[PDB]
């Protein structure tokens, strides 16, 4: 029902931490 940000940042932050958990270095290594 169009959340007021409550279910927006929480949903857009999981993939960021997921990206950070498997984030590669600037030189790939």
From Swiss-Prot:
Domain of life from the UniProt record: Viruses
Localization per record: Host endoplasmic reticulum membrane; Host mitochondrion; Host cell membrane
TM stretches of this protein: 2-23
Residue intervals on the Lumenal side: 24-29
Membrane topology: Multi-pass membrane protein
Described purpose of this protein according to its UniProt entry: Ion channel protein that acts as a viroporin and plays an essential role in the assembly, envelopment and secretion of viral particles. Regulates the host cell secretory pathway, which induces the intracellular retention of viral glycoproteins and favors assembly of viral particles. Creates a pore in acidic organelles and releases Ca(2+) and H(+) in the cytoplasm of infected cells, leading to a productive viral infection. High levels of cytoplasmic Ca(2+) may trigger membrane trafficking and transport of viral ER-associated proteins to viroplasms, sites of viral genome replication.
Subunit comment: Homohexamer. Homoheptamer. Interacts with protease NS2.
Protein name per the record: Viroporin p7
Organism whose genome encodes this protein: Hepatitis C virus genotype 1b (isolate Japanese)
Species lineage: Viruses, Riboviria, Orthornavirae, Kitrinoviricota, Flasuviricetes
Part of the full-length chain shown: 781 to 809 of 3010
């Amino acid at each position: 029902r169009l959340v007021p940000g409550a279910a927006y940042a929480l949903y857009g932050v999981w993939p960021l931490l997921l990206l950070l958990l498997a984030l590669p270095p600037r030189a790939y290594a």
